[PDB]
Every structure is written in C-alpha cells, then in structure tokens.
Amino acid sequence: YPVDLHMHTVASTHAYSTLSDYIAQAKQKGIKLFAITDHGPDMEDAPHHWHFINMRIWPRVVDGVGILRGIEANIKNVDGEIDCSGKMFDSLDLIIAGFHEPVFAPHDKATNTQAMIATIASGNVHIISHPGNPKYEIDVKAVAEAAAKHQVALEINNSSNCREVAAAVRDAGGWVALGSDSHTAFTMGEFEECLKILDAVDFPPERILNVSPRRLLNFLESRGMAPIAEFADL
Amino acid sequence: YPVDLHMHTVASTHAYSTLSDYIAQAKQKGIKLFAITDHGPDMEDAPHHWHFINMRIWPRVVDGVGILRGIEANIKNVDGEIDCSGKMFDSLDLIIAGFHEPVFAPHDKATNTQAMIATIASGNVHIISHPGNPKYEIDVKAVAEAAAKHQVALEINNSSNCREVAAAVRDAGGWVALGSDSHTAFTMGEFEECLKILDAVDFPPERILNVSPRRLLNFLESRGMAPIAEFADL
Amino acid sequence: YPVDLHMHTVASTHAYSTLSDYIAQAKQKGIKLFAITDHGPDMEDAPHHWHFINMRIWPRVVDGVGILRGIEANIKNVDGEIDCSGKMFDSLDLIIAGFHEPVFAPHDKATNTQAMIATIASGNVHIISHPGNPKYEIDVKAVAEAAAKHQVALEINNSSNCREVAAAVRDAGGWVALGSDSHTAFTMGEFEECLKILDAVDFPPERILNVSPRRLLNFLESRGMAPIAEFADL
Ligand code: NA
Ligand code: NA
Ligand code: NA
Ligand code: NA
Ligand code: NA
Ligand code: NA
Ligand code: NA
Ligand code: NA
Ligand code: NA
Ligand SMILES: [Zn+2]
Ligand SMILES: [Zn+2]
Ligand SMILES: [Zn+2]
C-alpha cells in the first residue's frame, strides 16, 4: 500500500515533522501518494484556519511523490457540522473528520452515533477517523451502513472495536481507508497492525483505498473532486 | 537574480518550511543570499516577538548561502509605526513593512497613502511589501516619489497595480526589490511573473536590488547597517 | 563529548530547528546521544503540554543517533514545583528545570535559593539549567551541596557566576552537565566556552556527564529510569 492518508505536522505542537520530512520519508519508503491532514482549528493545540486555506500553494509532486492537501476535521455537533469553512474546502482535496474531546466530548451512544452518521450524510467528508475508538461508543453496524450508502470510508487506524468496524464495512459494502495517524514521518505508511485486523476478518482487498494512488484518486473524483492532472502518472 | 528577499517559515502556520528547508532549496536553485521575513507579531497567525529577537543566534553562512535576518512588519497606523520594537531592530538586518487587514484594515485612499508614506519617511523600513495590492488603494506616484526620496525600495511581489508601481519607480528614481513571498521553499527565487511586469515597462536593471548579493548588501549599508563580514565573498 | 543535553525546537517560535534537523546535525558532528528539552508549558512562547506527552511516539535511534525525550521545565514556586504533570513525566526521560522570568521572576537571593534547592530536593529533576545566570542571585555553595546530596547535576551552559558554580560542584562532589542550549541545530554539541570554564577550575572529567552516552544513561537509571534497550550499543 503505497498510499498513506492520515498524518500530522508541526502545525500542532504534538506533532514533530514538516512537509519536507514527509516527502523525504515517502521517498525512502516507496510511498507514491500521501495526505497531510492536520487537526481542524477548533481543536486544542491546532493551527489557524489559514494553515488549510494556504495549502493551495503547495507543489503537487516533489521527488516523484504526490501530495494531497487535507484536514482531520472535528465533528462539532449532532447536526454533522465540522470545523471546515467554505474557503477551506476550496483549498483542500481530502476531508477526514472525527471525534476529539476538546470539540465533541464523548456522550451517550445515541448522541455519538447520530453525530457520526450526520457527518457521513452531510456529503462533505471522505473518511471518518478512528471510528473504533472505545472512548466514543457507537452503533457500528448503523455507522457502516450509512458510510456505504454515502460512499464514505471508515478508517482503520494503525496509531490505535476495530475488528468489528472492519467486519461491518465488509458486510455493508463500503470502503476502508488505512491511516498511520503519524505524528512523526518515521511511521509513515506503517500499517502492519491495520492489516492484521483486516486479515482477521478476511477483508476484501478490493475495498481498501490505499491499494494504489489511482484507486484513491478515483474515489475522490467520484465524490466530486476535479481531477488533479499532476497526478496522472501515479 | 541570486537574491530573494521575502519568504516565511513555520513560525506562521500558514507557512510550511523551516530555515533548513530554505537553505537546502537555495543551494539547489543557485540562490546565494536570502532573507527570512516572517510576519510581525501584531498579525494573526504570527510568531512571538522573541522569534525575531533570537534571530541574532543564526549562522550567517551555511553551505555557501548567506542568510539575512528579517521581518515582514505590519504598518500599524497613519503615523507610520510598525510592530517592531527596539530590541527586535537590534537583531534584524532587513525590515520589510506592509498592510495586512488584521492590523491595518483597508481604508480611504488618503488614509492608506498617508500611512504608507509615513512608514517610508520613518527611516526604519527598507522595503514596502506588495504596494500594488488592489485591496489598499494608494496614490502610487506620491508613494514612489517618497520612496525614492527616503531610499526605500518598493516590492514587486511574485506571489501576487504592479505595472503602475514599476513605472512609477522607474520615473521616481528609486529601487525595486523582488520577493517571492514564498510560504514554502519550493517557490524561492521564482520571479518569472515579476520580470514580465518589469519588462512591460522597460525597468532599468540597474535599479533592481536582487541583481547581486553585493548590490543588496551595499543598499543595506547605505541605510545604516554595519557591514556583515561573513558575507564578504558573496 | 558525544552527548548534548539541552536544545530547543520550533515548538517555541524563538527556536528554529526540528527533530530531523538535530538528527542530521548530530550525524554530521559525531554526537551519539542528544536530548530535546523544549520549554515547559507555563513559559511564554512555549508548546502545549501534549507536545511532551506525545514524545512517547518518537523513534529511539535514527541514523545511529540516540534520542532522549526531555523538557526544560520551569521552576514555579518556592516549594520546588515545576510545570510538568504526571502524564508528562511518564513520557519523558530527562527533566531539566530552571528559572525563567515569565514563570518565576527574579527575587531576593533567599527566595531564589529556596526555590532552586526545593526543586533539587523534590527528586523530580535531573539537571538545573543555567544556575550561573546573574539575573537570579543564589547561594551557590548551598545549591551545589544540595545538588550533590540529591544527585542532581548543575548545568554549565555554552549559550551563556559559572566558574563559581563549577568550583562549587567540584568541591561538593556532584555532577556537571554540559548543554549548548541550542535554538538552532547549528550549535549542537558546541561546548568550547563551557570547557574553558571547567579548565579554569581543573574540574574532574570523571564528573562530567557528557563524557559518554553510557555515563549519562547510567546516571538516569540511578535516578530511577527504567533502562532503554534501544540504547544498549551507545
Ligand atoms: Na475541496
Ligand atoms: Na484523531
Ligand atoms: Na490524527
Ligand atoms: Na537592525
Ligand atoms: Na504580506
Ligand atoms: Na509575505
Ligand atoms: Na520519566
Ligand atoms: Na533556559
Ligand atoms: Na534552554
Ligand atoms: Zn494528534
Ligand atoms: Zn503570509
Ligand atoms: Zn529559549
């Protein structure tokens, strides 16, 4: 899997690598396409909203490695709103969203489930991060079914109910995304533990987004992204 | 033009490169002298004032590339004051100043013009950044005339009324400075678009500061900077 | 001395290098073990507490260089408390502590002395940073005696009453730690000025922690640190 979809830079002080560190490590590890997905601005220890707006200036391909502009947005409420403005959406390619205590504290199972499903149904998000987090109890099957319906991927997070999520996605028919949730570039692309979970449930390789740069880019285009010419050859 | 005078680091989250990234890219692109000019502390998403005071510890020359310590200060008011303290001036070599909405909102043409001219006449600034910004209407000729009188350069900004500024400087007799306004090191030294504007007005190469490291350093010394020995050989 | 124990990253905007910059410079300068010791969270221009908690994810050895997870904590009061929580202690290997005006303003000699000695006697700190700072008058002999008793090293800081501190430690029988207090990686391991102070007092090399990675690691283990297997070969 030459694609990693979830990692963080020094824009949060609880991460320690820069854009150039991720490019260099990708080069070393055979990763051909990666996304930087810094924490959304409503989070603690998070960057300013301009951090995301100004990603529009980034080079697309450096040293043969493609770079997606992303966000790990924060689910704000039971209506499925996230901390990403219209100007921010305009600059970004990949929208991940998830639960973080400073923004959305863990609540009753139904509150968590409704918020997650409303985020999925909003049409604004591509991947829900760490849905297996035991801190946020959810109706996994209902979430997987909604994710399949709205073509939203559920993440299996290497940084980490994950077998239950994987099996639920398998049966619901949706996509899985693998993400290292790296906070240094040293763990980019490392999915060993994710893969064991997927194997414990005989997850179909055909529904793993990270199989190839083209599979992932095709998914984003199906969700409405204008094609990125600079990524043709990936 | 082996000199670039305007770029930003991770000290603002809307920039993404470090000092070491700029050194490495300079090395790759044949840039022999560059200035880091982070946003002044009154700006949103800007670093602490100590970020500028502590630039006094930087090496002067790394891998053959000279490093100027700078600031893109913010014009604060119609008296021409900027967000740079005496201790900060003491640590810095290059003072750029300009209009940014969070500090000085766009106002009537006369308010903008008076503030810009007062900044020029203060004697504390070397370059006015993006004077051609249509968001801040100014009397371009009056600004160019004041800039020539006080030996302040007007910037032609590649990141970007620019032809009008260039022609005004040509006739007023002042200097132009080229700046990439890079927020990643990938665009360091890239002035293609600046050069087209200058060519559309047959701007005299003799009044472009970036022609050589020595021309730029001679300008700073004429404005009062003690000579930097470590830069002799540039 | 292939060990440097005190340096800072971009997590403070008054520092300019990243973890990867320090690894690369260590490699270049023959440093085999270094500690990142960013300013504690109560300081101005300092990172969030999560910056220290999440250091638990760092690789231990990169390109042959070992990496200690540290903090330059701030002495908070005359009871010897510092701005380091239990969760933070759990993630860190090296605890440095010192006086910084925004947290603990310079006061009477007895106030400064009591706070420093209480920090030493707390058992939570390994090194007291810049005890020779003339801004904070202390009873040097009393501090050195307490440091020897509680097996706390006093720093001789290259960034910088230092001869008096060195002679006091010599006679009290404690350890000295050398630290560059680097705010860029370009000065990592540079102790020339520290060594002159130590030579002016014929300081015994046997009580300089930085002599070898193993001497330093043995000291941390004697203070209660579980052994770091990944550092066996250093
Ligand atoms: Na978009
Ligand atoms: Na997360
Ligand atoms: Na994350
Ligand atoms: Na100056
Ligand atoms: Na600007
Ligand atoms: Na700028
Ligand atoms: Na510890
Ligand atoms: Na200090
Ligand atoms: Na320090
Ligand atoms: Zn995080
Ligand atoms: Zn900017
Ligand atoms: Zn500092």
Curated annotation (Swiss-Prot), chains A, B, C:
Gene3D superfamilies: Metal-dependent hydrolases. Disruption phenotype: Mutants show no swarming ability. The keyword ATP-binding does not apply. It is an enzyme of class 3 (hydrolase). One of its GO terms (cellular component) is cytosol. Binds 3 Zn(2+) ions per subunit. It comes from the Bacteria. Its EC number is 3.1.3.-. Zn(2+) 1 binds at residues 6, 8, 72, 181. Zn(2+) 2 binds at residues 14, 39, 183. GO terms for molecular function: identical protein binding; phosphatase activity; phosphoric ester hydrolase activity; zinc ion binding. It holds the Pfam family PHP. The keyword Plastid does not apply. Keywords: Hydrolase, Metal-binding, Zinc. Belongs to the PHP family. Homotrimer. Interacts with YcdY. Hydrolyzes p-nitrophenyl phosphate (pNPP) in vitro. Involved in the swarming motility process. This is Probable phosphatase YcdX. The lineage of its organism: Bacteria, Pseudomonadati, Pseudomonadota, Gammaproteobacteria, Enterobacterales.
